Amino acid sequence: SHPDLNKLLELWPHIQEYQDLALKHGINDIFQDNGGKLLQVLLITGLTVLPEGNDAVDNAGQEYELKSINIDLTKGFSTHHHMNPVIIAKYRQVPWIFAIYRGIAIEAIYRLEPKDLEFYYDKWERKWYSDGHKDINNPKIPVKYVMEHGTKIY
Amino acid sequence: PDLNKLLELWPHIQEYQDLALKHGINDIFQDNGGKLLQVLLITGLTVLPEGNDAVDNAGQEYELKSINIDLTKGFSTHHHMNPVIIAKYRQVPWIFAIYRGIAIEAIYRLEPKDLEFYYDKWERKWYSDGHKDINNPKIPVKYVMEHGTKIY
DNA sequence: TGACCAGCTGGTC
DNA sequence: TGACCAGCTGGT
Ligand SMILES: [Ca+2]
Ligand SMILES: [Ca+2]
Ligand SMILES: [Ca+2]
Ligand SMILES: [Ca+2]
Structure with a gap:
């Protein structure tokens, strides 16, 4: 029409x-949960996808949490719609890979180690107990913080 | 490689x-943009700038839903279904788009009349459940096909 | 920003 | 088949 x-x-x-190409790489729907972008990160970093939970692993066995952002729309990295210690529990264990996009165009890729993230885990943890054990609705990690604390891998 | x-x-x-931007879709890889675009272009509908999603030339607004029947056979509704979500939902017909991976299979239409069955169910359950939100209750594709008007 | 609001969905027994 | 379990985010 x-x-x-x-x-x-x-x-x-x-x-x-x-x-x-995405199917050949463990992603089954480029239009679902940013599959199309996730592929770009994998092919660039040499990481592989894991079939919930950690998102990828390197050839050394290291697993990672992977995040994306459209800098044409927002500057704060999304985390989880219901943050609490259990979710922070999974997170604290692995390093993160943050990817930055201008729409669907890959801009950069940073990597933060768990230590580079305690700061936010502590904040959220602190606010959790205080707010009377109330989940936090998607707290954000500034792109600035990522850039100044991570390692630019791309 | x-x-x-x-x-x-x-x-x-x-x-x-x-092409998606042109049609009001910010990212084809976010929130199923690449697929929303397919439906808009086929149905001829227009996106809405996050309650109702599209609208027809007549000005009628719609709630649009999608699914990969390769993976699942139940349509997602809302992660936190409550009487408020439902109150709005009750205001417009729904467009259900069925896919096989990325290949659009068909599109259907449901009137609030034909969804009141599920609205009642979620509402009653919400109230009697002690006011607890329902975590993404699903609408079976079989229900969509049997109560909706194939529009593709 | 810190902090609230709100989207798109699959998976399973 | 209902009812639970989870994920990817943007907007102010
Ligand atoms: Ca994850
Ligand atoms: Ca992630
Ligand atoms: Ca909607
Ligand atoms: Ca919708």
Whole structure:
């Protein structure tokens, strides 16, 4: 019905090829949970996806939590819609990989070690107990903090 | 390795993203943008700038839902379903888009009339459950197909 | 920002 | 088949 549709059809074959490339890499839907972006991070860093929980591992066995952000829209990294010590429990264990995008375009990739994150885990932990054991609705990690505390791996 | 293929494939992927922006979709890889765009272009609907999602030329607003029947057979509704969520939901028809991976299979339409069955269920359960939010109660594709108007 | 608000979904017994 | 269990985020 909408005319632009024929353009989508011309494009679609290549899109399907990208999906195949993502499927070849453990991602089954490039349009789900940022699959399309996650692939970019994997192919660049040489990390592999893990089939909930940690998101990836390197050839050394190290597992990681991976995060994305569209700098064209926001500056604070999302974490979890219901943060609490149990969620912070999983997080504290592995280093994180933060990817920065301008839309779907990969800008950079930083890597923070658990130590680089205690600060926020402590804040959230502190606020948790205090607020009367009330979950925190997606607290954010500034892109600035990531850039100044992580290691630019890309 | 495969990084090359991705780089080759990229110009097009970027066109699709340009095409989505044009149609009010910020990221094709976020919140299923790439798929929302497919439905808009087929149905001819227009996105809405996060309650209702699209609207027709007549000005009728819709709640739009998607699914990969390769993985699941139940439509997600809301992670924290409560009588407020429901109150709004009750105001507009729904567009259900069925997919096989990234391949759009079909699209259906449901009137609030045809969803009141589930609204009542969640509401009653919410109230009698001690006012506890329901964690993403699902609407079966079989229900959608049997009570909805195929529009694709 | 710190802190509130609010989206899109799959997985399973 | 209902009812629980979880994930990816942006907006102010
Ligand atoms: Ca995770
Ligand atoms: Ca993540
Ligand atoms: Ca909505
Ligand atoms: Ca929707």
